[PDB]
Amino acid sequence: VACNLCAVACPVGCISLQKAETKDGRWYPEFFRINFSRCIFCGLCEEACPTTAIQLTPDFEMGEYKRQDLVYEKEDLLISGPGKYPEYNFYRMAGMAIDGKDKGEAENEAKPIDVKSLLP
Amino acid sequence: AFELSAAEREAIEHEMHHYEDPRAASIEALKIVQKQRGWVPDGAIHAIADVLGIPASDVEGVATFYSQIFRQPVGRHVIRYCDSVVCHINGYQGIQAALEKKLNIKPGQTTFDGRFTLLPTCCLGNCDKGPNMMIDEDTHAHLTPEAIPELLERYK
Amino acid sequence: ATIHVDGKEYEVNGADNLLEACLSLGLDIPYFCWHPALGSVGACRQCAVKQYQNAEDTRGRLVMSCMTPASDGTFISIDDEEAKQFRESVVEWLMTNHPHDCPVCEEGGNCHLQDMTVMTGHSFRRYRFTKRTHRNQDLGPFISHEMNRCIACYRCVRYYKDYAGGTDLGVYGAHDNVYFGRPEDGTLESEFSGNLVEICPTGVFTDKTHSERYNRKWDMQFAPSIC
Amino acid sequence: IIRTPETHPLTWRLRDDKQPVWLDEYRSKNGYEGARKALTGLSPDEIVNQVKDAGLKGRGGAGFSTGLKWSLMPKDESMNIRYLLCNADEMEPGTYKDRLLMEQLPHLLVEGMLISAFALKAYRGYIFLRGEYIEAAVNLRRAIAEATEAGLLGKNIMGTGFDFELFVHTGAGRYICGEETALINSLEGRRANPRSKPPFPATSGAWGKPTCVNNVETLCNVPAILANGVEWYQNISKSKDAGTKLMGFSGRVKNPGLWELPFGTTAREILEDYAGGMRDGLKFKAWQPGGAGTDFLTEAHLDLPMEFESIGKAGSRLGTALAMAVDHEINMVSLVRNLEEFFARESCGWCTPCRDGLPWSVKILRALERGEGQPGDIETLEQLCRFLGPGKTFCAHAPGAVEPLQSAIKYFREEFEAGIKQPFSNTHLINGIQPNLLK
Amino acid sequence: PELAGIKDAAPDATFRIRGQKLAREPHRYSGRTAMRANISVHEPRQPQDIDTMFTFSMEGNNQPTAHRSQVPFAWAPGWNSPQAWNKFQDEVGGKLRFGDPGVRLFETSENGLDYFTSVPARFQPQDGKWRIAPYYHLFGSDELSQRAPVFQSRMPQPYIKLNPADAAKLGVNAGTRVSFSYDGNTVTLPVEIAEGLTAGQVGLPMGMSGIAPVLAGAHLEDLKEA
Amino acid sequence: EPAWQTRDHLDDPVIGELRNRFGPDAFTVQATRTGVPVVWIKREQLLEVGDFLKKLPKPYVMLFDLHGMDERLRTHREGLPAADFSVFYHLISIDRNRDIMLKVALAENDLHVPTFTKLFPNANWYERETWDLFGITFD
Ligand SMILES: Cc1cc2nc3c(=O)[nH]c(=O)nc-3n(C[C@H](O)[C@H](O)[C@H](O)COP(=O)(O)O)c2cc1C
Numbered sequence A: 001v002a003c004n005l006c007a008v009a010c011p012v013g014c015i016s017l018q019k020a021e022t023k024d025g026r027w028y029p030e031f032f033r034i035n036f037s038r039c040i041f042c043g044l045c046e047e048a049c050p051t052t053a054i055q056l057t058p059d060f061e062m063g064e065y066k067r068q069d070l071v072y073e074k075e076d077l078l079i080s081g082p083g084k085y086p087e088y089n090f091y092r093m094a095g096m097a098i099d100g101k102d103k104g105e106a107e108n109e110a111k112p113i114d115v116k117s118l119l120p
Numbered sequence B: 001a002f003e004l005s006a007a008e009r010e011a012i013e014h015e016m017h018h019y020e021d022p023r024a025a026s027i028e029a030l031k032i033v034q035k036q037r038g039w040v041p042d043g044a045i046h047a048i049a050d051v052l053g054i055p056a057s058d059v060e061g062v063a064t065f066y067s068q069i070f071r072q073p074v075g076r077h078v079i080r081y082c083d084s085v086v087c088h089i090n091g092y093q094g095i096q097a098a099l100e101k102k103l104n105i106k107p108g109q110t111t112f113d114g115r116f117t118l119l120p121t122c123c124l125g126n127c128d129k130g131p132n133m134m135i136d137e138d139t140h141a142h143l144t145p146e147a148i149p150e151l152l153e154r155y156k
Numbered sequence C: 001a002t003i004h005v006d007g008k009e010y011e012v013n014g015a016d017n018l019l020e021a022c023l024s025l026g027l028d029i030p031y032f033c034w035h036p037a038l039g040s041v042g043a044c045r046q047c048a049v050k051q052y053q054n055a056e057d058t059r060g061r062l063v064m065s066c067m068t069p070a071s072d073g074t075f076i077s078i079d080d081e082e083a084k085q086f087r088e089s090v091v092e093w094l095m096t097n098h099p100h101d102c103p104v105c106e107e108g109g110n111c112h113l114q115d116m117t118v119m120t121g122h123s124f125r126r127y128r129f130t131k132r133t134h135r136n137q138d139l140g141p142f143i144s145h146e147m148n149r150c151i152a153c154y155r156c157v158r159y160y161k162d163y164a165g166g167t168d169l170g171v172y173g174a175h176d177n178v179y180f181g182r183p184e185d186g187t188l189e190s191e192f193s194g195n196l197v198e199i200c201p202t203g204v205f206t207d208k209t210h211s212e213r214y215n216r217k218w219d220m221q222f223a224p225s226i227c
Numbered sequence D: 001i002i003r004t005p006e007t008h009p010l011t012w013r014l015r016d017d018k019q020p021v022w023l024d025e026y027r028s029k030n031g032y033e034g035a036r037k038a039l040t041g042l043s044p045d046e047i048v049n050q051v052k053d054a055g056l057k058g059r060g061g062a063g064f065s066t067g068l069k070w071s072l073m074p075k076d077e078s079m080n081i082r083y084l085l086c087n088a089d090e091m092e093p094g095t096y097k098d099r100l101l102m103e104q105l106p107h108l109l110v111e112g113m114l115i116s117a118f119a120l121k122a123y124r125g126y127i128f129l130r131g132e133y134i135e136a137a138v139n140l141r142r143a144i145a146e147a148t149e150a151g152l153l154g155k156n157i158m159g160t161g162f163d164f165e166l167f168v169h170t171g172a173g174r175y176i177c178g179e180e181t182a183l184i185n186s187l188e189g190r191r192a193n194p195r196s197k198p199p200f201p202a203t204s205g206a207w208g209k210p211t212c213v214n215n216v217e218t219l220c221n222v223p224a225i226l227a228n229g230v231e232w233y234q235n236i237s238k239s240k241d242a243g244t245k246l247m248g249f250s251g252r253v254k255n256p257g258l259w260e261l262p263f264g265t266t267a268r269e270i271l272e273d274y275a276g277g278m279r280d281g282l283k284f285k286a287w288q289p290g291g292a293g294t295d296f297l298t299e300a301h302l303d304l305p306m307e308f309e310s311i312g313k314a315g316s317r318l319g320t321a322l323a324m325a326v327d328h329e330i331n332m333v334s335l336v337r338n339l340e341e342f343f344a345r346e347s348c349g350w351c352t353p354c355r356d357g358l359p360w361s362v363k364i365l366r367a368l369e370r371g372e373g374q375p376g377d378i379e380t381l382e383q384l385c386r387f388l389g390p391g392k393t394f395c396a397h398a399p400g401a402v403e404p405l406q407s408a409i410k411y412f413r414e415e416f417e418a419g420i421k422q423p424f425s426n427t428h429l430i431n432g433i434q435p436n437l438l439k
Numbered sequence E: 001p002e003l004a005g006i007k008d009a010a011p012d013a014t015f016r017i018r019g020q021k022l023a024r025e026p027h028r029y030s031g032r033t034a035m036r037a038n039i040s041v042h043e044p045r046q047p048q049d050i051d052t053m054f055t056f057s058m059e060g061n062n063q064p065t066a067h068r069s070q071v072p073f074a075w076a077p078g079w080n081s082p083q084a085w086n087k088f089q090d091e092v093g094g095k096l097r098f099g100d101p102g103v104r105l106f107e108t109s110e111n112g113l114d115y116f117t118s119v120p121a122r123f124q125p126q127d128g129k130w131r132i133a134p135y136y137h138l139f140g141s142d143e144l145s146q147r148a149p150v151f152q153s154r155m156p157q158p159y160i161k162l163n164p165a166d167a168a169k170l171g172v173n174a175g176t177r178v179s180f181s182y183d184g185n186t187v188t189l190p191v192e193i194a195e196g197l198t199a200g201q202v203g204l205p206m207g208m209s210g211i212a213p214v215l216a217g218a219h220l221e222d223l224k225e226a
Numbered sequence F: 001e002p003a004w005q006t007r008d009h010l011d012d013p014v015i016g017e018l019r020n021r022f023g024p025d026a027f028t029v030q031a032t033r034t035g036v037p038v039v040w041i042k043r044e045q046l047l048e049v050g051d052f053l054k055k056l057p058k059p060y061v062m063l064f065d066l067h068g069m070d071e072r073l074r075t076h077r078e079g080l081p082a083a084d085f086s087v088f089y090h091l092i093s094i095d096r097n098r099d100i101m102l103k104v105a106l107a108e109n110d111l112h113v114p115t116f117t118k119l120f121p122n123a124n125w126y127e128r129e130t131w132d133l134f135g136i137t138f139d
């Protein structure tokens, strides 16, 4: 959701991202880059992620010929599935209305009562 | 589009004559509009605002604050059944069940023809004769579930 | 005037209330509904301290410090256990209907409600029921509206009406369905409507222009400039 | 049941056919003699002193003395614009005394407002009446028209030069409008948020002017004091609360009604000798002395006098002295759930503990009703009761809301403990994340 | 010498708080090894500020008890909101601690001016001429504010303001377009009726597209319907 | 009283011994959560305080630590002596199973302390590091 919590929780400052919004109103990263030449693989960004988007995976073979190629953009980080946390969906809990999920349709949410309604 | 009638404006101004501040006639102005038109439409807030010289946000806050100022379209008759403690002791739940069976609605909404609308209301001040129910201008006491069809048939 | 906060003597101005006098001394009292420019109305009940009649008093009484004058020889306690528990309870009651919205909220990292939730030490939720929701209005090109995040502190209406002289913003509804906004969708008419983004202690009124290219407050580079 | 004027000052002129008494019949039955004596033989300060010395306390539920409240008015002659308000709202559940007082004796209320307006030097008077009392509104408007027709209201009343105009402001159906500062706010056409004190309404009330708000019953005892004398009023009963009071038991009893009794009358006398006891095959369980905003009392407290101080030490309030009886058939969890649903939907939304803690108690009581209670719920209710007391909330609606809840927990805890059937569960398991198994 | 006070508006670039500069960004400023990593993985040199006492980094002071008047942003631990300005003041709602920034250039003179005897005559509505009444807009009269793209939706469509009597004299209604020429520039605007305007005047929105603010008090020719 | 509670450690016998030897106004006791008695000693009494602790019946035989601190930006120094800089000496008595911190305040211009190398030979590298990282001279 491009909330920038992983970027600030990073002690090396090797995560850069920008928030963008679609037409329905959901937040997403416009870009997302991790400088893996700086990253110490400490797992603080995964610990700080409130959506379980960023994850540290069992893969150690990341050697490169050029240091510029260790800067991983969003196309090199976004995988096809949920990774280590299979069922969590932040937008099923958040209060913002997005496509397919209106007001009062999140977890533990009542339908919105208009102030003009006849009931006291 | 909402135009105030001449009689409504005259009654509103006569109510403004009773107070030293024109804002004090907002509740009675909303009640006058509701009595004339069944409820208070969206343009009525702006019309009362221009008549009284107070902002429309104030009139909207007053209209949405009070329960008896209707800001949604209702039916031609309003059932107001008392859900308070003494009528609960005297069994208002059977009266509510009979009303839900006859009208075939839930409380708060209107019938398909707009003939009745059902509302749980506050204590009517008739607790010694409970349970009580308020139709548009008439209070009814000593209610029984069997008397609901014979009581509701006199309101068309 | 002379006050005694937690057994420590302080010299303050007697014309101020207790909350602003204690905040001027560096003491931390949580507060929502009070503003230095708007005055005190005692709505949010967050600024509660324990006041004693004299030095040799043990029972005391909870008072709102924003509504209590800082009179001479006034004995109070902020770190009293009862006052701390009541302030935590007020934050918890505000937290019962609050949306799970902080990652996708523009007030995150700049939120007074976040700061006071942390300051009260309230981090365990024992409320298991549903939370109320609200539709949002379109307030124009400048102010974005998110009514779910409201805590009903009445700062917006007090500022916009009693201070700014605006007419189109107000409070509607009742008991726990209080709505803060315009009667219909439309642009906020006041020329000072933008100060709502700093008056509102939550994410209800946000800078839409900033919300386009949003970044958190810790990520900004700031400078003191002149408009 | 005979009703002499010496011992039933408010109900002796009532008619047996339940018809209202108009101006000619009211004047026939010793009407507007106290008003004539007050306006032609007493200074306003003298009338205030007589009301103060008569021990006339308030009848709305607070029990504050009327003379002390009237003595808070400013002594400056520069502020001659003053208002007298009659709290005819009667929005508290279990209360039906003002409906009887205004639907059948409107001229008594008119005379009391006239006397109190002369005593307070009040130039205008308003009757804040609820919108459901249509018959009371019609009777009060007809009585006002008859009073100005006979010269009892308007300009130059009784030739004394005193001007007083009385209006009837019908409410729009909200319970919080009965609160005096919220009554002032709703009279000004605003949202009925109550105000903070100090300043009191006597210093600056309606439209910033000195304003005194009094109940219907207090302004009904005022003409009896001003006509029959002060030493007659102090000698009605041998109790600290002088004068009579409209008391009565309601709810599944043999004779649910309203009678006029002196203070110090025990609650068992009202239940047995007047209400006839409970109905057939019903075991008495509990009773509320003063409506929905008062603590429940058991049958052991039934042998207690109906005074403010006597019910105060019992752990309750006298309130409006209109008691409601609960038998054994009623589940107390359901009754307190209905009470809290009323008190949570009648919140004004101004202040946090009432607005956001009454619905939490409502949902907890709903869960206890359906047997879906969880551990910590009764502890949450007790925390809500102790954190919604006086001073914690902005007005007195929330202490009166939590009084029946704490009283029912104190006396009937086994019914609340019987709704807890499920283990506590606030979180659902998230796959891949091991929970913190707190002990 | 009339601008001699601007030396004291802010201290010079050698101003330090216990030897360190004033920070421009908060302590938890993030992404310092990745914001420019798409351009080059090598971190660039930190921009040096020789002009002022501030630094383009977090390596500086923003303590609320620091002896200074220029505060870039308010942040205290536990107070991340705009309520941290309470921590940055001596008393809340008062002045900034150690004084507010800015210095008055001139003091109040001991002796005043004389009464201006040049009393103007009344406004005379002359036929053919049209006095331009300025109509300023908060969103649209400032040039750089007009350049802001978010103001284009907030700013109104340019309406030429006319008296009802003058609009009846020209026969133009509310909303129709009239064309007027000033300095040989015939431009067209739609008419809005202004009842409060005085007859003989025509209202023009200042600062807008083509309507320079130097038209205040300027005469106008050839006001005709397009 | 939990283990993390702020203690002043005035009941430590070393505080009473220091009071009986140097007087009650010779030093200031600071309440901390360090778990040790923290004692602000005047600079001119530092060598004799260290010698007195070295000659105790159950003496403080080990210099556990010695380092500086820049206190110019420290805002919450209530109850602390005025100091632009400070030097702390952590000493351990193994026989007592106790430890004490001694703090010497230093002004910004007068950044020099007497050397501790005579009492404890391991103070050499600590004083070299304190000079290196803080500019505090050791005479
Ligand atoms: C929530 C609430 C509701 C109240 N409703 C009424 C009411 O309906 N009628 C009434 O006379 N007093 C009501 N009161 C009491 C008033 O605040 C006030 O004490 C009373 O109207 C006048 O005082 P009196 O008894 O001396 O006449 C209410 C108080 C509260 C807190």
Ligand code: SF4
Residues within 6 Å of the ligand: A006, A009, A010, A011, A012, A013, A014, A015, A034, A038, A039, A040, A041, A042, A043, A044, A045, A046
């Ligand atoms: S694992 Fe890498 S990217 Fe994540 S916080 Fe640690 S250093 Fe930063």
Ligand code: SF4
Residues within 6 Å of the ligand: A001, A002, A003, A004, A005, A006, A007, A017, A045, A048, A049, A050, A051, A052, A053, A054, C103
């Ligand atoms: S990866 Fe997680 S922590 Fe980082 S911006 Fe996205 S949602 Fe926030």
Ligand code: SF4
Residues within 6 Å of the ligand: C098, C099, C100, C101, C102, C105, C106, C107, C108, C109, C111, C112, C113, C114, C149, C201, C202, C203, C204
């Ligand atoms: S307003 Fe504050 S507490 Fe609420 S979602 Fe936004 S950041 Fe979180």
Ligand code: SF4
Residues within 6 Å of the ligand: C149, C150, C151, C152, C153, C154, C155, C156, C157, C180, C199, C200, C201, C202, C204, C205
């Ligand atoms: S919208 Fe914001 S300022 Fe207004 S009451 Fe709600 S939290 Fe307070």
Ligand code: SF4
Residues within 6 Å of the ligand: D176, D194, D346, D347, D348, D349, D350, D351, D352, D354, D355, D393, D394, D395, D396, D397, D398
């Ligand atoms: S307790 Fe608070 S929210 Fe409730 S009715 Fe009173 S002022 Fe309003």
Ligand code: FES
Residues within 6 Å of the ligand: B082, B083, B084, B085, B086, B087, B088, B122, B123, B124, B125, B126, B127, B130, B131, B132, D093, D094, D095
């Ligand atoms: S409880 Fe129903 S009329 Fe009072």
Ligand code: FES
Residues within 6 Å of the ligand: C019, C030, C031, C032, C033, C034, C041, C042, C043, C044, C045, C046, C047, C048, C064, C065, C066, C067
């Ligand atoms: S800050 Fe005092 S009650 Fe809100």
